[PDB]
Amino acid sequence: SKITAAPMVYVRGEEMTAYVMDLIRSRWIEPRVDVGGWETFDLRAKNRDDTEDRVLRDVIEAGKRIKAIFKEPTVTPTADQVKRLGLRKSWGSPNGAMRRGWNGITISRDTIHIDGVELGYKKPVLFERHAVGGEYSAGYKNVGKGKLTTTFTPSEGPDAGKTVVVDEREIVDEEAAVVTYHNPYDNVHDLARFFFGRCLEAKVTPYVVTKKTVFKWQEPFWQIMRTVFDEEFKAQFVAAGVMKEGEELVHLLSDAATMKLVQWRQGGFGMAAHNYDGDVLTDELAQVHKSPGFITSNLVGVHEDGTLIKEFEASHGTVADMDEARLRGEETSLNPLGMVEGLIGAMNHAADVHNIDRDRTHAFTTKMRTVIHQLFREGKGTRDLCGPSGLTTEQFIDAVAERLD
């Protein structure tokens, strides 16, 4: 009998990655797995516009109920796409909304390692991206000349109820952006614990990455991480052989960290950073390693009731350059491994949390990984790995299908 898929949220996107995942669902999953328990949502920018984002609100609700989500890449539409797609409005990112809506703590993005496949980093690299805050949460306007005033009224402490000026400035340009955001730092305690725990288990040296010299408001990110490190982890790292006695936790400036990602080809390190810095640095990490096909991503959030909410995704976008080529009848070669690891993670988590066909799901998802890893080993991967002699998107999908059984 087909495997019974456990309840799981499936978020569909568009462009090349939706095309790829339709093939994978059709040729790898459905002949072996009954997916009736999946809740599938259409997060095409068009459908979001048609539903006034009710579909996004529904994904967020379902994630709370089900706790295991696979998220395909989605489009955050440009002004030019607003016209081409016939959207009544620009729409923001559905990723920020989900990350916020699930009380996101960390987006973990780690390098993939396959026995016998030489990649950019020799040993595992771990990345913890702060899942919320920063410019992803910003209010803004595009304006001309005028007065911009920011105030804060605390609700606790000796100055409760009194308003202070955070900033006031005259805009003297006919064209300017004015932007306000916050960084919520309470859950950076949780992030630090999670990050240092994983680094300890993988035996990699941790680094904290910020621009706190100039972006001085970021100081608590560093201070919280250092305090958690010193009080809960420093001794464990020394005892495990990962760091030496008297070796302090190291801070890197975000610009310098881009240099460390190129330089540190041995791997064997971890970085934690704010939301946007993590976005930039994890794409860089992907390309140094090989491509975004060789990175895993997952979000850890928390339900109001305290149970974890786990979303799994590729690190990358919808691969619009290959989509253009696809629609013109030209060859493409999208590496599905990143996305597939996400779907594996989500399916395994779903089966464990909801106690449905656990053994068989784990064996099947392990099999998908194995087959993919073996094709890569045999030089029958996609072109990101193998160069021009690699297989096309469709060739690779079929090669996996033949070996699954």
Ligand X SMILES: NC(=O)c1ccc[n+]([C@@H]2O[C@H](COP(=O)([O-])OP(=O)(O)OC[C@H]3O[C@@H](n4cnc5c(N)ncnc54)[C@H](O)[C@@H]3O)[C@@H](O)[C@H]2O)c1
Q: Which residues bind ligand X (CB under 6 A)?
A: 73-76, 95, 213, 253, 256, 259, 291-293, 313, 316-322, 334-335, 338, 384
Told to check if 227 binds its own copies by CB under 8 A, we report no
Q: Candidates 24-32, 248-256, 369-377, 393-401: pick the segment binding its own copies (CB under 8 A).
A: 248-256
* Discontinuities in the chain (C→N > 2.5 Å), after residue: none
Q: Site for its own copies (CB under 8 A): how many residues?
A: 86
DSSP 290: S
Is 277 annotated to bind ligand?
no
Among residues 254, 105, 251, the alpha carbon closest in space to that of 189 is found at 105
Among residues 333, 348, 286, 356, the alpha carbon closest in space to that of 314 is found at 286
Among residues 95, 8, 106, 2, the alpha carbon closest in space to that of 56 is found at 95
| Residue showing the smallest CB distance to ligand X in the complex | 317
Among residues 169, 183, 241, the alpha carbon closest in space to that of 212 is found at 183
Residues pairing with 42 in the sheet: 12
- 312 in Cβ contact with 70 (< 8 Å): yes
The binder of its own copies chosen from 174, 304, 402, 405 (CB under 8 A): 174
Told to check if 77 binds its own copies by CB under 8 A, we report yes
Q: Which residues contact 262 (CB under 8 A, 6 or more apart)?
A: 284, 288
329 φ/ψ sector (left φ>0, alpha ψ -120 to 50, else beta): left
The binder of its own copies chosen from 90, 266, 366, 370 (CB under 8 A): 90
Provide, rounded to whole angstroms, the least separation between the CB of residue 278 and ligand X: 12
Provide, rounded to whole angstroms, the least separation between the CB of residue 59 and its own copies: 18
The single-letter code of the amino acid at 138 is A
Is 37 annotated to bind ligand?
no
Told to check if 85 binds its own copies by CB under 8 A, we report no
The SS3 of residue 163 is coil
Provide, rounded to whole angstroms, the least separation between the CB of residue 24 and its own copies: 23
Tokens 């599905």 belong to which residue?
Answer: 336
Is 283 annotated to bind ligand?
yes
Provide, rounded to whole angstroms, the least separation between the CB of residue 162 and its own copies: 10
CA 156, chain centre distance (Å): 35
115 binds, among ligand X, its own copies, none (CB under 5 to 8 A by kind): none
From residue 294 to residue 333, the character string flagging contacts with its own copies as x (rule: CB under 8 A) and all else as - is -----------------------x----------------
Interface with its own copies in residues 104-143 (CB under 8 A): 135-136, 138-143
- C-beta closer to ligand X: residue 316 or 357: 316
- C-beta closer to ligand X: residue 208 or 322: 322
The whole-angstrom separation of Cα 295 and Cα 285 is: 8
175 φ/ψ sector (left φ>0, alpha ψ -120 to 50, else beta): beta
Is 22 annotated to bind ligand?
no
Q: Candidates 179-187, 227-235, 237-245, 396-404: pick the segment binding its own copies (CB under 8 A).
A: 179-187
The SS3 of residue 95 is helix
The binder of its own copies chosen from 119, 199, 288, 371 (CB under 8 A): 288
Told to check if 287 binds its own copies by CB under 8 A, we report yes
Is 97 annotated to bind ligand?
yes
The SS3 of residue 390 is coil
The whole-angstrom separation of Cα 379 and Cα 385 is: 8
Is 94 annotated to bind ligand?
yes
Residues pairing with 34 in the sheet: 4
The whole-angstrom separation of Cα 270 and Cα 110 is: 9
166 binds, among ligand X, its own copies, none (CB under 5 to 8 A by kind): its own copies
Told to check if 281 binds its own copies by CB under 8 A, we report yes
Told to check if 240 binds its own copies by CB under 8 A, we report no
Is 316 annotated to bind ligand?
yes
Please classify residue 156 by burial: count the beta carbons closer than 10 Å to its beta carbon, then call 0-12 exposed, 13-18 middle and 19+ buried: exposed
- 127 in Cβ contact with 285 (< 8 Å): yes
The single-letter code of the amino acid at 130 is H
Told to check if 182 binds its own copies by CB under 8 A, we report yes
- C-beta closer to ligand X: residue 166 or 214: 214
- C-beta closer to its own copies: residue 250 or 327: 250
Provide, rounded to whole angstroms, the least separation between the CB of residue 137 and its own copies: 8
> Which residues fall in the annotated binding site for D-threo-isocitrate?
93-99, 129, 136, 211, 255, 279
**Per the annotation, where are the binding residues for NAD(+)?**
74-76, 95, 260, 316-321, 335
